[PDB]
Every structure is written in structure tokens, then in C-alpha cells.
Ligand SMILES: CC(=O)SCCNC(=O)CCNC(=O)[C@H](O)C(C)(C)COP(=O)(O)OP(=O)(O)OC[C@H]1O[C@@H](n2cnc3c(N)ncnc32)[C@H](O)[C@@H]1OP(=O)(O)O
């Protein structure tokens with residue numbers, strides 16, 4: 001089993017290494033810190049035996065709704081990045097991280113909906129999102145550096 005807890009500054013090196021091992025979207029150090037610092041309550045890590053084995057990094061912002069079409073702003077949470085190490089996959093880790101984060105986006109940050117981007121061929125990640133009620137909103141052509149399209153995916157809170 002694993003345990004879950006909020007991310008801490010000391011976790012950031014392990015988080016960065018996890019991000020580089022599993023994703024081609026490699027955010028710099030300061031980036032992780034400022035999100036930890038601004039949105040920490042929805043920033044979670046999964047721990048196995050004194051080691052961080054996964055994380056979810058959140059963002060909270062004002063913006064326009066992906067759910068309804070309104071001319072006024074609404075409070076949105078964004079899953080900026082999430083990853084679990086290969087060894088610890090299929091154990092519910094990503095699931096529990098995302099529910100943890102979404103609950104915090106709802107209750108700590110008063111978001112009314114949440115969104116994310118995923119590569120159109122990241123089938124395991126898409127499947128995980130759809131299990132958690134996310135729906136495709138938009139295709140963003142050539143969104144990723146390597147040229148792949150993204151789905152903008154969203155769900156209400
Ligand atoms: C928001 C963005 O940044 S998008 C990029 C997301 N991050 C990545 O792709 C990094 C590389 N991949 C990973 O780290 C992991 O595979 C993740 C994040 C996709 C999922 O990690 P996991 O801990 O294995 O998720 P979890 O075990 O809770 O999966 C739950 C459900 O998701 C689906 N799912 C997850 N992985 C797979 C897979 N390889 N194949 C098919 N379905 C899958 C399944 O329906 C699964 O339910 P089940 O195991 O009962 O059958």
C-alpha cells in the first residue's frame with residue numbers, strides 16, 4: 001500500500017525526477033515551488049516507504065467556463081500535471097490523488113469546475129479521467145512541443 005499527503009518543499013526534488021521520468025513536459029524548479037506555494041492544499045504526493053512515487057500539481061484561476069457558455073468569469077481548478085511511477089501503477093494511486101486534489105479545489109479554493117489537457121493518444125490517462133467524469137471539450141491542434149494534439153477535458157464540481 002501507499003499513503004497520501006500534501007506536497008512539501010522537501011518533496012520537490014523527488015517530484016521533479018518523477019516528472020522527467022514519466023513526462024516530456026518538464027517544468028522547472030521554481031514552477032513546482034510557486035504552485036506548491038499558491039495552491040498547496042490541492043498539491044498531493046503518494047508515499048511508499050519514505051519515498052514519493054507520484055504527485056498531482058494543481059492550479060486555481062479565474063476564467064471562462066468549459067461547462068456552460070457564460071460571458072462572466074467562473075472559478076476553475078486545473079490539473080497542471082499528474083504522474084505515478086511505472087512500478088506503482090494500476091493500484092488506484094492516480095485515482096486517489098485526483099479525488100484528493102479535486103476535493104480541495106472544491107472546498108479550499110471554491111472552484112466550480114475543473115479542467116486539464118492530455119495528449120490525444122494518452123489512452124490510459126484519458127481512460128482515468130473519463131472514469132472520474134471528465135469529458136472532451138475541445139481538440140487543441142499541435143498543442144504539445146513534439147506536435148501532438150491535445151484534448152481539453154473538463155468536469156463540473
Ligand atoms: C494532466 C496531464 O498532465 S496528462 C498526463 C498524465 N500523466 C502521465 O501520462 C504520466 C505517465 N502515466 C502515469 O503516470 C500513470 O499511468 C497514470 C497517471 C496515467 C495513471 O496512474 P495509475 O495510478 O495507474 O492510475 P489508476 O491505477 O488509479 O487507474 C484507475 C483507472 O484508470 C484506467 N487506467 C489507468 N491506467 C491504465 C492503463 N495502462 N491501461 C488501461 N487503463 C488504465 C483504468 O480504467 C483504471 O481502472 P482499473 O485499474 O480498475 O482497471
Ligand SMILES: [Ca+2]
Nearest residue numbers: 118119122125
Ligand atoms: Ca498527455
